[PDB]
Ligand binder design. Sequence first.
Ligand SMILES: [Mg+2]
Ligand SMILES: [Mg+2]
Ligand SMILES: [Mg+2]
Ligand SMILES: [Mg+2]
Ligand SMILES: [Mg+2]
Ligand SMILES: [Mg+2]
Ligand SMILES: [Mg+2]
Ligand SMILES: [Mg+2]
Ligand SMILES: [Mg+2]
Ligand SMILES: [Mg+2]
Ligand SMILES: [Mg+2]
Ligand SMILES: [Mg+2]
Ligand SMILES: [Mg+2]
Ligand SMILES: [Mg+2]
Ligand SMILES: [Mg+2]
Ligand SMILES: [Zn+2]
Lengths: 152, 108, 166, 148, 287, 304
Amino acid sequence: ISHGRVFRRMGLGPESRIHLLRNLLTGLVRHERIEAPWARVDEMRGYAEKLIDYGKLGDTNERAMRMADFWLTEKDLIPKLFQVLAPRYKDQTGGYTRMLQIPNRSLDRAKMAVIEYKGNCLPPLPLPRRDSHLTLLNQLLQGLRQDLRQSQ
Amino acid sequence: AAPKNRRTIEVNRCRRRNPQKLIKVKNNIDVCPECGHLKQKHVLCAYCYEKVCKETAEIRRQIGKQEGGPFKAPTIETVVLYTGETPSEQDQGKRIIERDRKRPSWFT
Amino acid sequence: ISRKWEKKNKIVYPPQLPGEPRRPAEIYHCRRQIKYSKDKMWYLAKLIRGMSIDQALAQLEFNDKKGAKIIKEVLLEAQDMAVRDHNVEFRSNLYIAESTSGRGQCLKRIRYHGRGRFGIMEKVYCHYFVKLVEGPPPPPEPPKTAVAHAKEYIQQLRSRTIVHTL
Amino acid sequence: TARGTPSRFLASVLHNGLGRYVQQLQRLSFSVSRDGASSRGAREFVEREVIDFARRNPGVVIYVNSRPCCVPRVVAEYLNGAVREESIHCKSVEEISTLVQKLADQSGLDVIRIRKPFHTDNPSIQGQWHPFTNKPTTFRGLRPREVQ
Amino acid sequence: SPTELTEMRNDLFNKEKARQLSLTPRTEKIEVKHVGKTDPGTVFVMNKNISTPYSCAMHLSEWYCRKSILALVDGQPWDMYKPLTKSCEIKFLTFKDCDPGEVNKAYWRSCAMMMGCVIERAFKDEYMVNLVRAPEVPVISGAFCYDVVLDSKLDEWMPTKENLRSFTKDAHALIYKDLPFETLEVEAKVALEIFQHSKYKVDFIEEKASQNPERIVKLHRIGDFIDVSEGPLIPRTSICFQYEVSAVHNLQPTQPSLIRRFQGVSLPVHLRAHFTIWDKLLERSRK
Amino acid sequence: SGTWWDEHLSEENVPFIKQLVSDEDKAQLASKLCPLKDEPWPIHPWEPGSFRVGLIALKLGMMPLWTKDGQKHVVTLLQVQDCHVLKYTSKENCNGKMATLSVGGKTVSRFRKATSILEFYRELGLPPKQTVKIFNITDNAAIKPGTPLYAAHFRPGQYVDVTAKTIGKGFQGVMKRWGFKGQPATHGQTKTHRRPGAVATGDIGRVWPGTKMPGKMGNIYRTEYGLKVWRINTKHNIIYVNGSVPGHKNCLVKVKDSKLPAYKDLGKNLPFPTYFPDGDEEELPEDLYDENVCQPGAPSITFA
RNA sequence: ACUGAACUCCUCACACCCAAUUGGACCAAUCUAUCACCCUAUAGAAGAACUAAUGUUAGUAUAAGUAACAUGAAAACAUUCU
Ligand SMILES: [Mg+2]
Ligand SMILES: [Mg+2]
Ligand SMILES: [Mg+2]
Ligand SMILES: [Mg+2]
Ligand SMILES: [Mg+2]
Ligand SMILES: [Mg+2]
Ligand SMILES: [Mg+2]
Ligand SMILES: [Mg+2]
Ligand SMILES: [Mg+2]
Ligand SMILES: [Mg+2]
Ligand SMILES: [Mg+2]
Ligand SMILES: [Mg+2]
Ligand SMILES: [Mg+2]
Ligand SMILES: [Mg+2]
Ligand SMILES: [Mg+2]
Ligand SMILES: [Zn+2]
């Protein structure tokens, strides 16, 4: 039974899980876009947003600094978090990362996912887009919307 | 615990040709509007993604070239400029990445 | 070994009379000595048996099995040669008529067990065979209706005779 | 066994003995060797018995081939279009004469299991049994427990 | 009798098609360059008047055959089964495109014509039914409509809910028939010969010939039913999935004659709506 | 090809459609607030032997409750959410012993329901409901479909039966499933700690039907009998039932009158068909308490 | 009263239902003498016939696509991290 269990069991155990996620997160901070197995990415996603929140909390803050020091193995990334990533997202209250499923891995046929920090410099992903408003169904519904607003 | 008797081809066929064993037909397959190659819905188009990844790799090679050695992550934002492009007011005070090719249509 | 499937494309039919329906083009193609189990290959062969060429290619493209890409390659080769050599009008206007796996020539190796004892390991090889036929894929056989069953049962009753009599 | 073998009903070719009896055997081909011990009996048959058989059965055409062969054969053809090949290899004159006469007597119908030892196209004269035979009619044709 | 009229119309249509087919200069070849985002710069070397855009799709893939609704030939809308005439640039238009306006119009017109066919065959022999036209009403309006003149006998008659259901069932039967949308490009005289009986059709053909520099008009056939169209149509009847005949309204200026406007709403297989959304579209289309 | 509702909708059409359908649901629910103003089915007085309809409630959770005697009783909170009568079936039509009322609870999405269910609810003029349960009633207890049901249907001091699917524990071994003692830890016991012992007897060359073996436990319907109603909260439609009911929190439970022979004919004081708020005779307070219940806001109890 | 066998009768036929053992009539294929010449004849010979030896060798099944086996992470694939 695993009712209300929120964390996956991965790696060689709890510490190993932390270390695996830490490496993925370090990769994400450096590269701003990471391919990895879907489950591992999904697990890391939460930590990614939390890290930005601690980044926002301030450079001078000792608590935030300690957290940043732990989660970023490469130390050059710690300035980047506080001075680049945190100021970028100052406007929005969340939804810093974007996760999309990728065609399965060649070797082991693993479910794969791309994770990026929003507003990166890199070429945009081929994101899924909803149908145009000018489609037949959308036209009919626009007609309906117009009729309803005219009624009021 | 060993088999008491050889299982026949009739019984074996029944086991291994069961619908449960069979491969299921997929209804997720649609044409990617951008390239015309087949994509599974809910999944990024393989062709389009490969294209984006190739460009990303090239930019990253250039990033590494400009940085020089490890532990040289900039403390400023980055922008990528292609041939016949100049930094704007926004692009001023950002790290400039130069590419030897033209702007892709999809890159905006 | 036998290689009859190859010789099937070498058949030449006499020219058709004007007052005759157009003969659908048949294409025979196989890959020999695929490093893959025939049993595993069978599932993929069965999958695409009734399908059109494009449907089959789509299904194979998004399959996770090793043999899927091999069948995809064979199908593409067959589609190409169909148009080029066998005078098929449209590359899309093809459907899989036959799709089969057969055993290949195999190699015996030794598998070491956890005493002096051992086992004989067999390196599996298989052939994939395909026949493509020009035209739309034939419609699947409709499920038997209540009226069809009823008719069949009446027919059974009407068929019966007084047995062991004059 | 029956389950392992085809079966047929008892039949005639064209209602053979109804109007007039017509001999079903049509042609009889013999392959005989001039030299060869197998065809010894066959030779003696051709010498003495075949002429008389031909006279007795004018409807049958007899062919005698007389060619080199290890086994002599008789091929019997019937009006229905059946062909029967019978080996007369190392058989006496008596045995061959017997076999040939049997072929003359036989029709072209297959020698398989015959399902019924009788066949009729009009089995009934008074009318085949149905449930309502041997049942009395009722007034107004009223069903049981019917008010009207 | 209606049967003899449709028979005669079919004979004339077939005769005209045969005439147009006969003047082909022995399977001439045309070069058709595909200009699209997908599979760029592919050329089709195809028959001058035998070949169609659908056969171009058949050269590419099944996906093109399935999804393509119209062909844009030299930037002009073109039926999938309409034969090509000259060396040209082709692209395929689907419902999913950024601006599917042309596809929307084509689908709308096609459904209008289908409804026309249905309502023609629907009424009894004793009653007289005369089809006026299919107005070019926008998709945003919510209902494709057709104008019909009925006999004086059914002036006081108003269709019931069951009657509308019956029209719907007939339309679904027509969908199930899976009939191609046959097209013909003719001189006015031929159209006049075909549509000599219906004065409304006469008038409509006259104005259509007038707007064109020549006297060239377009005709479309589903199955034993012929109608003159405003523009290009969808390839096949099977494209429609959800098809209901919404309502019938009497037009207000009924001084000379009484015209019924038949209104209905449709969506293709590609753009299937949920039961709930569909119910909203129905309740709007009745207005 | 597979399709969902918002597959083919635009960016701006999705919020519009959501709003439109939500508003229609709200309107339909609000429409049914006055059943007595609409043409009702005849209301009959209570008779011995009569059985009334029950409810479908959502299990909110548990809190402690105290009594004047000083004993603490844990109670379960059952919230009644959009509970309506859906269908009536006569005894002859049902081919059963009693007339039946189908009652639904907890409104759900229209987009996620089958066409058949959608059509049925469309005819009703109510948004679709998660679960429908059937209550066997007498003819005199018949209620017109569409009529809302409230927590005040039950009254404090009354006993109820509660039926729900139990918490699914998935595949379980004999020790957790049937409380088998298992085998000792040490003193040998090579591979036997949690295993079933002898499954059957030697002489029978088989295993009896219904032997206790490892399998799926939970996720089945169970009934808790003779649970006391301690308190009703009329404002939020809460029933406070004694002890624990089956199922997880936020599940849907079937609540009916107790079938136990002790509480056979205690339905005299209860509102017979149902409670109709629109009647508006002696408007009920926010909270209905049992005599023994220590009400919040009451002075501290002294055992005199 | 009737049913009821391989008993008995009936139409035709007849060597044609015991272990070990014993007597007899035939005979597959091969080689040789002499025949024969789309595959045989009369004789003489003999490594002269396999549903069975946990038989020998080889092939291929069953158990079974089972048991089991394998590559720390990201990435510019420079490198860095655990
Ligand atoms: Mg879980
Ligand atoms: Mg693991
Ligand atoms: Mg060793
Ligand atoms: Mg213990
Ligand atoms: Mg142990
Ligand atoms: Mg041990
Ligand atoms: Mg007897
Ligand atoms: Mg006997
Ligand atoms: Mg006897
Ligand atoms: Mg005897
Ligand atoms: Mg021997
Ligand atoms: Mg043997
Ligand atoms: Mg042996
Ligand atoms: Mg097993
Ligand atoms: Mg394992
Ligand atoms: Zn793409």
